[PDB]
Amino acid sequence: SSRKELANAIRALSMDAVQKAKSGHPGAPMGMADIAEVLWRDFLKHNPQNPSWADRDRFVLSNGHGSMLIYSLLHLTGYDLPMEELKNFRQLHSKTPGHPEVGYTAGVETTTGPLGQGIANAVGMAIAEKTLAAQFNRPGHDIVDHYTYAFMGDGCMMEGISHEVCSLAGTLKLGKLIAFYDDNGISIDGHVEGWFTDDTAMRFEAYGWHVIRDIDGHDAASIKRAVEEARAVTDKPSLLMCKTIIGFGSPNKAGTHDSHGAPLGDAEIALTREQLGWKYAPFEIPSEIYAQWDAKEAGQAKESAWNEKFAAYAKAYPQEAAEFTRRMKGEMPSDFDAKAKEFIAKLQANPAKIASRKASQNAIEAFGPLLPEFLGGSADLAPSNLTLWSGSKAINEDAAGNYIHYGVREFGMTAIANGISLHGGFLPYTSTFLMFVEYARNAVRMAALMKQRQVMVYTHDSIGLGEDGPTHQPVEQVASLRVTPNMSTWRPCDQVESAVAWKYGVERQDGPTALILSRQNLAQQERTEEQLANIARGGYVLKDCAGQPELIFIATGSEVELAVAAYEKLTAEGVKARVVSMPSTDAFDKQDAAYRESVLPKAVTARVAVEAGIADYWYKYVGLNGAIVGMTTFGESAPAELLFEEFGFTVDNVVAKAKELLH
Amino acid sequence: SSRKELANAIRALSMDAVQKAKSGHPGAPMGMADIAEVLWRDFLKHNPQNPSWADRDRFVLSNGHGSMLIYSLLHLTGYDLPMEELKNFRQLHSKTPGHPEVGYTAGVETTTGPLGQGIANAVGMAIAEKTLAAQFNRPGHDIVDHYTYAFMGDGCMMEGISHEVCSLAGTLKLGKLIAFYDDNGISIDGHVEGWFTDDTAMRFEAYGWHVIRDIDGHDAASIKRAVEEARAVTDKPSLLMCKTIIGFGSPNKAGTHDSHGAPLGDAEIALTREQLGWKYAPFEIPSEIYAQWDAKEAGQAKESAWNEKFAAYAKAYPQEAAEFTRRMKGEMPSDFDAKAKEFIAKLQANPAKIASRKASQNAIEAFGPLLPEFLGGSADLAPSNLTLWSGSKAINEDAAGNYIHYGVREFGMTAIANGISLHGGFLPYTSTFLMFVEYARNAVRMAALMKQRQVMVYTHDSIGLGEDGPTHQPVEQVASLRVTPNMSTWRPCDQVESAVAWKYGVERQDGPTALILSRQNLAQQERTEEQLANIARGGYVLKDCAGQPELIFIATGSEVELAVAAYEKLTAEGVKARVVSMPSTDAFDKQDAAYRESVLPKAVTARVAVEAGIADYWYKYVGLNGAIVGMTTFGESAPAELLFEEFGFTVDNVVAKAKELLHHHH
Ligand SMILES: Cc1ncc(C[n+]2csc(CCOP(=O)(O)OP(=O)(O)O)c2C)c(N)n1
Ligand SMILES: Cc1ncc(C[n+]2csc(CCOP(=O)(O)OP(=O)(O)O)c2C)c(N)n1
Ligand SMILES: O=C[C@H](O)[C@H](O)[C@H](O)COP(=O)(O)O
Ligand SMILES: O=P(O)(O)OC[C@H]1O[C@@H](O)[C@H](O)[C@@H]1O
Ligand SMILES: [Ca+2]
Ligand SMILES: [Ca+2]
């Protein structure tokens, strides 16, 4: 069959599946089908039989609304995505959700839909490949060698996050990253010139990208030549400016916003078949077209050749090969648990009053020699977030390193890290001041949604940071993280809880972990063996009374010391008081009901929460008959000590609020 | 004095103020002092005696960590910011907080600190001036004519938001926007080349900006020539690449990251005085230097000339002048309250089962003729968010318009809108799908912090949007807004609550208002006159029983219909039930104790929250002995009706959970 006929199979499947669902986006799949046909059939190195092959090229659909494009590709090339799944596009529990999702659909590399994040993820995957290659490749043994291809549209180009990650991609000279820009001149509001006039090629040249202008996105020869040129440029990421017609094939909707985001309609589909000369019924693909699209045979040949290469590598470099396999699988070193526990025990036995940001650095230092998979960084706050350890090596200086200077790019940093986690081989950590999680907020959510392991190191967690004032002092940010599905959030009260939280973070297999860390010094709490072990349970009894408590303080982070001081005062008066330290609400919630009852007995309603963050969160644990010593306002610019006093984080106020309950 | 001496006054006040506070950022003020001296002394049109003068130039410090730069400028030029306040830099309740804050420091135009948002605000202020000029200027009466100047550094340049707002500023050909880039090669991690290598000039040329390269940021003549060039270019915003030395003056810390964000140290300050030839003690400025810095006489002259111009305008165009004054003050039309109430009453009397996104569009259509100050827009979702009304006119088409195609730029859009509200003359509304509030999240917080009036139109509020699936379906986003200080958040249950929320939003002078709106059709509820009035109280009794309820449903938005259905089932079975509609938790919380007690009596503990959003939020109103019919997971890609079924948003399930609750209580 002709290349245009092969590409037209994508057009037919896409418009038909959208029509059947009465929902979806036929424009981009129709506009990009010719580009996809060249990339997938001529260049993409992949095995449909094993979507997890370590050395496969990675493809990313950043314009993820065009989900039928990727489903057509996966089906046609022989992945485990039958026609019935395409016929169930956008239907409950199908393998063909409205935007592509990593994890159930074979071959989908990442979850897109939020514009701009796909390209960010791609930048992360290219960073991972370059770094893994530098770490593992040996003379005569290039076991890591793959491209990262991304499709993206006007929406991704307009988003700020594209500037963050494409800027950094240029700095890092990501020669194996190749992006195709679907330059179709249309967005939802109509012709883009009213709101988007960038000389996008010039913009990308400013980033140090290799840019190929004026590609006819509907001509196989033009596209193929451009990809060849891009692959020949090894020291710069490449952008291919692909001029396309959105909804290509539709006489009445091609080139219009009408084709973007709704079914074409039965009549228009009939006209499209006529224009394309496509003779097949909906969901009919002839054997000749499958024969030219199918990649099972080539895929298995390529992967088997790689397996043989890896076997030879394992002979010459057995320890390295074992590390590669362990790291690609995301498995932890077998003695990590024992070694981390030893560190935790040492801290408990050797008290230090330090900021939890420093306790965090200390955990990185302890874990560093144990976790060569670390690929960490900070958004231009290394000396403040304390993300460097003695073994940190910046990848802009040493390609085989383990540290990234992300610059002032919180959103890009976090979505890049999502790419890194998705790639395999690494354990990313990222960092900024907690307030600026708000800049990265949707990428944090995406890590949770995609069930990705990433440790998010968020320092300067409250009014305790002092003089920088209300634009920097978090109040409501922790609460937002706590109510995020599949997020783990830890606000350690001292260096011991900080190490436990770090351990929990690196050992998570199925989601991210945010560490909520102080600028200011935190007192260490004394713990029994049982209490020490129970830190990992997220909430535990820190100070207690004999028999049923009359009063329970629930405190986190920097406020545990305050709660303990109130407890001592009330205990001396003869109140049966308890202090619960609650470093992680999510880990506590996951405990069995007997454990939860032992910490927060259901019959004890006199509960006082204490946390320098938004009060409203705490009704979850204090109910309607408790008290909350929290924040209800923005902060103020002043020294920390005076702020805590001003906002009622005092022994007198905590005691007074508790006494109010006991009547 | 020489220009360098005058600029050194800023250097001295800045390093000394930071030293006394033992906290702050001397680097940027010291690096940008010569630029500030030229801009402020030679170009800036302002009156220190009236920081609210309608036609003043606007200045924005986007690299807001260098706060002592602006405090030095305001003090030296004669604003109401005494030396005692500079001595109280970074101290509780001073007029000199660590990052500048609009509101309680004379002459500060916006609150910065979050990098990138300053330049966004500046773009908003420039859009406001251009639009206001187009709307109000008349032949021989150019009553609107001022520049917007912004300072920004490497941090602002790296941030994605700079791309969003500078791209759009290029499209809109904002000839009176002039930005100065503090090109000093240093950020917190060190020399920027390790992580920041853009050809920034080429980037801004790609945006359609006029760029002036290689300006010696420490040479007044060079700076002045560059400003004159930027002012001569009337059809593009300008970027002046100013090469500076961070911490200029410090022998040991200039040009180093060490000067960025900590006090220089007393020894180093002594050496800096010696290098700069600055002889005066900390917080000492001689009369002769004040005489050269002071702007009171020039300022008064310029404002008086403008007042004469405005008086002539008022004579020739009295209605237009009255509108200009009203709009600059942010006052509402005198008949707006009455007309809006008439609209609301009409809706209650004429039920329509429509999506609250459509109800929102209908309110825009009703208010549009009444509020010529509207400057609304959507981030490339006009046909989905339903932000256009019949009188909308895009400002890229007609500069005198009232609508902005923001493109796919949620964060930039919202921070631009903050600039628009800060400028005066307009009432901005912005819009995207609720999920993508997460892209704009800190700009939303900044509107709340800055006490700004902006209506935020957030559609597609839940799993009710259907097939687009979990990357689009909000779950936890409403809760996030509800816990934000000074945020108002409305999740209207029908077209009537939608109109009330819109009225509340436009009339809210001291903070923003987010509207949480459905894709799918919402049932109109029956209301008495009293209930209709009570919508604005945020939470109110919608359905009730005789005597103390044994069960209270609390519901919002699309789920009120479900709660009412459950209430009907239970009532028919002889259960004593109540339904509370809670369109706004923040408004409800602001009601007095007696009113809140009347709605959610403390005696009644069997409370069931119903909302297609994260369940954990609702413990606030249901306590530990209630029930919550909410979401606890991400969504799924499927038709909305199947999703509501899947996730337990059914009459049978709500009734079952309510009965299960009552069984446990009994
Ligand atoms: C962050 C974000 N904002 C908004 C949307 C809604 N949206 C989806 S596509 C689009 C604009 C059109 O973008 P483009 O890539 O040019 O679409 P195409 O040409 O492929 O049809 C928008 C606003 C989104 N998915 N993500
Ligand atoms: C959104 C955001 N992220 C991080 C910070 C912390 N921060 C303040 S300045 C800076 C980097 C230095 O930027 P630059 O403007 O080049 O500083 P300068 O040369 O004026 O000292 C950072 C990361 C912030 N204020 N806002
Ligand atoms: O992500 C935005 C998509 O393009 C929309 O899913 C699509 O345009 C449908 O819009 P609506 O929800 O108004 O039917
Ligand atoms: O002392 P910390 O809080 O680490 O940092 C002080 C300031 O220096 C930089 O980090 C930032 O600019 C911050 O505002
Ligand atoms: Ca497009
Ligand atoms: Ca800098």
Largest CA distance in chain B: 89
Locate tokens 């992580």: which residue?
A: B195
Residue A353 has what DSSP assignment?
Answer: -
Spatial distance between the Cα atoms of A184 and A28, rounded to a whole number of angstroms: 9
Contacts of A155 in chain B (CB under 8 A): 380, 408
What is the token pair recorded at A111? 């979850």
User: A114 to chain B nearest CA, in Å?
Assistant: 7
Ligand nearest to the CA of A263: 3
Question: Among B384, B410, B521, which is best to mutate for testing ligand 3, by the most ligand atoms less than 8 A from CB?
Answer: B384
Q: Please tell me the distance from the alpha carbon of residue A51 to that of residue A80, in angstroms, as a whole number.
A: 10
3-state secondary structure B108-158: CCCCCCCCCHHHHHHHHHHHHHHHHHHHHCECCECCCCCCEEEEECHHHHH
Strand partners, A58: A148
Q: What is the DSSP string of B63-109?
A: SGGGHHHHHHHHHHHT-S--HHHHHTTTSTT-S--SS--TTSSTT--
The span from the CA of B69 to the CA of B54, in Å, is 24
**Alpha helices in A405-553, H assignment, sequence order:** 410-423, 441-449, 477-482, 495-507, 529-534
B653 token code pair = 């399930």
Cα distances (angstroms) measured from residue A461 to each of A559, A613, B114: 12, 9, 15
Written in H, E and C, the secondary structure of B429-487 is EEEEEHHHHHCCHHHHHHHHHCCCCCEEEEECCCHHHCCCCCCCCCCCHHHHHHCCCCC
- Tell how far the Cα of A99 is from the centroid of ligand 1, in angstroms: 12
Phi (first) and psi of residue B355, to 5 degrees: -65, 145
Ligand 3 centroid vs B472 CA: distance in angstroms? Answer: 10
> What number of helices (H) and strands (E) belong to chain B?
26, 20
Report d(CA A91, CA B640) in Å as an integer: 10
Pocket of ligand 4 (CB under 6 A): A 384, 468, 519; B 25, 65, 188, 261
Integer Cα distance of B53 and B46 in angstroms: 8
How far apart, in whole angstroms, are the C-alpha atoms of residue A537 and residue A524? Answer: 18
Using a CB-CB distance cutoff of 8 angstroms, which residues of chain A are in contact with residue B192? 407
Count CB neighbours of A325 within 10 A: 13
Q: Which two tokens mark A293?
A: 């699209």
Contacts of B644 in chain A (CB under 8 A): none
Q: Which of A378, A405, A616 sits opposite B194 (nearest CB)?
A: A405
The type of residue at A60 is V
CA atoms within 13 A on the CB side of A369: 8
Cα separation, A437 vs B317, whole angstroms:
50
CA distances (Å), origin B161, targets A160, B440, B562: 5, 9, 41
Closest CA to A83 of A282, A272, A235, A321: A282
Indicate the resolution in Å: 1.6
**In contact, A587 and A504? CB cutoff 8 Å:** yes
> Which residues have CB under 8 Å from A356's CB, separation 6+?
A459, A461, A492, A493, A494, A495, A497, A498, A515, A517, A518, A522, A557, A558
| Cβ–Cβ < 8 Å for B328, B306 | no
Which of A63, A188, A384, A418 is most worth mutating to test chain B (most B CB atoms within 10 A of its CB)? Answer: A188
Provide the pairing of β-strand B427-433 with B488-490: unpaired
B622/B607 Cα distance (integer angstroms)? 5
Dihedral of the alpha carbons of A650, A656, A658, A660, in degrees to the nearest 10: -150
**CA separation for the pair A512, A532 (Å, rounded):** 23
Contact A407 B637 (CB under 8 A): no
Number of A to B CB contacts under 8 A, please give it. 330
CA B393 to mean position of chain CA atoms: 23
| CB contact at 8 A, A409 and A168 | yes
Residue A26's SS3 state is coil
Give catalytic residues of A, as residue numbers: 410
Exposed e or buried b for every residue in A31-44, given b needs 16+ CB within 10 A?
bbbbbbbbbbbebb
Task: Please give the structure tokens belonging to residue B295.
Answer: 């702007």
CA distance B443 to B415: 5
Residue with CA closest to ligand 2 atom 21:
B260
Return the residue in B398, B471, B602 with the most chain A beta carbons within 10 A, the one to mutate for interface testing.
B471
* Tokens read off for B134: 């187009």
The CA distance from A491 to A502, in Å, is 11
Mutate to test the pocket of ligand 4, among B18, B23, B25 (most ligand atoms within 8 A of CB): B25
* Residue A126 CB partners (closer than 8 Å, separation 6+): A148, A169, A174, A176, A177, A237, A419
Q: How many residues are there in chain B?
A: 666
Q: Give which of B135, B137, B152, B146 is closest to B209, Cα–Cα.
A: B152
Cross-strand bridge partners of residue A65: none
From the candidates A161, A438, A597, A618, which should be mutated to test the interface with B, based on the most B CB atoms within 10 A?
A438
The answer to whether residues B209 and B238 touch, using CB atoms and an 8 Å cutoff, is yes
- The sign of the torsion formed by the CA atoms of A587, A590, A591, A594 equals positive
Residues whose CB is less than 8 angstroms from the CB of residue B620 and which lie 6 or more positions away in sequence, other chains included: A616, A619, B585
- Residues B251 and B272: their CA atoms lie apart, in Å, by 7
- Closest by Cα among B614, B634, B610, B466 to B552: B610
Would the CB of B27 count as within 6 Å of ligand 2? yes
Residue B583 CA to residue B581 CA, distance in Å, equals 6
CA distances from B66 to A200, A537, B72, B100, B120 (A): 33, 44, 11, 9, 18
Please work out whether the CB of residue A458 comes within 6 Å of at least one atom of ligand 2: no
Task: Among A25, A152, A154, say which to mutate for ligand 1: greatest number of ligand atoms within 8 Å of CB.
Answer: A154
Question: Could you tell me the strand order of the sheet in which A577-581 lies?
Answer: A540-543, A577-581, A551-555, A607-614, A627-631
Q: How far apart are the first and last CA of chain B?
A: 86
Chain centroid, CA A337 distance in Å: 25
Question: What distance in Å separates the CA atoms of residue B247 and residue B256, rounded to the nearest whole number?
Answer: 8
- What one-character DSSP code corresponds to residue B193? G
Catalytic site residue B410? yes
Nearest CA to B118 out of B128, B126, B129, B110 is that of B110
What amino acid occupies position A134?
A: A
Nearest to B485 among A467, A475, A643 (CB): A475
A256 Cβ partners below 8 Å, 6+ apart? Answer: A186, A246, A247
What is the 8-class DSSP label of residue A369? G
Residue with tokens 């060249």: A38
The binding site of A consists of 25, 65, 113-115, 154-155, 184, 186, 260, 357, 384, 436, 460, 468, 472, 519
Q: What letters, b where the CB count within 10 A reaches 16 and e where it falls short, cover A532-549?
A: bebbbbbbbbbbbbeeeb
* Residue A109: partners with Cβ closer than 8 Å, 6 or more residues away: A58, A59, A60, A102, A121, A125, A422
Give how far the C-alpha of residue A568 lies from the chain's centroid of Cα atoms, to the nearest Å.
43
Interface contact A160-B409, CB threshold 8 A:
yes
3-class secondary structure, A374 = strand
A162 contact residues in B (CB cutoff 8 A):
160, 163
Cβ pair B471:A114 closer than 8 A: yes
Which of B101, B109, B268, B410 is the catalytic position? B410
- Closest-lying ligand 4 atom to the alpha carbon of residue A519: 3
Say if the Cβ atoms of A486 and B90 lie within 8 Å: no
Tokens of A468: 């920088």
Q: How far apart are CA B447 and CA B510, in angstroms?
A: 10
Contact flag B483-A614 (C-beta cutoff 8 Å): yes
State the distance from the centre of ligand 4 to the C-alpha of B100, rounded, in angstroms: 16
Q: How far is the CA of B637 from the centre of ligand 3 (A)?
A: 13
Helix (H), strand (E), coil (C) string for A622-641? HCCCCEEEEECCCCCCCCHH
Chain-centroid distance of CA A283 in Å reads 35
What does DSSP say about strands B577-581 and B540-543: parallel, antiparallel, or unpaired? Answer: antiparallel
| Rounded alpha-carbon distances, angstroms, from residue A134 to A129, A137, A144 | 9, 6, 9
Best mutation target among A637, A645, A646 (most B Cβ atoms within 10 Å) is A637
Residue A440: DSSP 8-state: S
Q: Which of A71, A100, A66, A92 is nearest to A83 (CA)?
A: A71
A449 vs chain B: nearest CA distance in angstroms? 7
Q: Which of B97, B167, B171 sits opposite A469 (nearest CB)?
A: B97
- For β-strands B190-191 and B186-187, DSSP reports them as antiparallel
Question: How many other β-carbons are positioned within 10 Å of the β-carbon of residue A1?
Answer: 14
Distance separating alpha carbons of residues A326 and A346, to the nearest angstrom: 28
Q: Which two tokens stand for residue B285?
A: 């400025």
Q: How far apart are CA A605 and CA A662, in angstroms?
A: 10
E strand or H helix at B190: strand B190-191
B663 is in an annotated binding site: no
Among all residues of chain B, which has the CA nearest to that of A631? B485
Contacts of A384 in chain B (CB under 8 A): 188
Within a 10 A sphere around the Cβ of A292, how many other Cβ atoms?
A: 16
**Does B436 belong to an annotated binding site?**
yes
Q: In B322-349, which positions are buried (b, 16+ CB within 10 angstroms) versus exposed (e)?
A: ebbebbbeeebbeebeeebeebbeebbe
- Contact at CB, B439 and A435, closer than 8 angstroms: no
Q: Cβ distance A464 to A644 under 8 Å?
A: yes
Two structure tokens written together for A596? 């939860």
Distance, CA of B328 to CA of B35 (rounded, Å): 30
Using an 8 Å CB-CB cutoff, list chain B residues near A644.
none
DSSP assignment, residue B42?
Answer: I
Residues in Cβ contact with A303 at an 8 Å cutoff, skipping those fewer than 6 apart: A47, A49, A50, A53, A55, A56
Rg (CA), chain A: 28
What is the Cα–Cα distance from A231 to A247, expressed in whole angstroms?
28
Q: Ligand 2: which of A408, A413, A458 to mutate, judged by most atoms within 8 Å of the beta carbon? A: A408
Contact (CB, 8 A) for A187 and B407: yes
Query: Which token pair is A589?
Result: 């919630």
Please tell me the distance from the alpha carbon of residue B224 to that of residue B222, in angstroms, as a whole number: 5
Residue among A90, A206, A384 whose CB faces B203 most closely: A206
A399-404 — which CB contacts under 8 Å span 24+ positions?
A399/A130, A399/A131, A399/A133, A399/A134, A400/A131, A400/A134, A400/A135, A401/A131, A401/A134, A402/A372, A402/A374, A402/A375, A402/A376, A403/A375, A403/A376, A403/A377, A404/A127, A404/A375, A404/A376, A404/A377
Judging contacts by C-beta atoms under 8 Å, the chain A residues touching residue B94 are 637
Pair B18, B247: CB distance under 8 Å: no
Of A92, A112, A638, the CB nearest to B636: A92
Q: Is the dihedral of CA B361, B365, B370, B375 positive or negative?
A: positive
In chain A the domains, ranked by start, together with CATH numbers, are 1-325 (3.40.50.970), 326-536 (3.40.50.970), 537-663 (3.40.50.920)
CA distance B151 to chain A (A): 17
**A188 contacts B381 by C-beta, under 8 angstroms:** yes
Residues in chain A: 663
Question: Would you call A480 and B482 a contact, using CB atoms and an 8 Å cutoff?
Answer: no
Which long-range CB contacts under 8 A does A282-287 form with residues at least 24 apart? A282/A12, A282/A16, A282/A19, A282/A20, A283/A13, A283/A16, A283/A83, A283/A86, A283/A87, A285/A9, A285/A13, A285/A76, A285/A83
Nearest to A442 by CA among A401, A411, A480: A411
Distance CA B595, CA B539 (A): 10
Under an 8 A CB cutoff, do A471 and B113 touch?
yes
Question: How many Å lie between the centroid of ligand 5 and the Cα of residue A8?
Answer: 20
Nearest to B415 by CA among B166, B78, B136: B166
Query: E strand or H helix at A608, and its extent?
Result: strand A607-614
What distance in Å separates the CA atoms of residue B657 and residue B651, rounded to the nearest whole number?
A: 10
The three-class DSSP label of residue B173 is: coil
Q: For residue A627, what are the β-bridge partners? A: A608
| Residue among B436, B440, B468 at smallest CA distance from B454 | B440
CA-CA distance, B606 to B471, in Å (whole number)?
34
- Nearest C-alpha neighbor of A153 from the set A219, A65, A24: A65
Q: Which of A205, A382, A441 sits opposite B438 (nearest CB)?
A: A441
Q: Order across the sheet with B627-631: list the strands.
A: B540-543, B577-581, B551-555, B607-614, B627-631
State the Cα–Cα distance between residues B151 and A579, nearest whole angstrom.
49
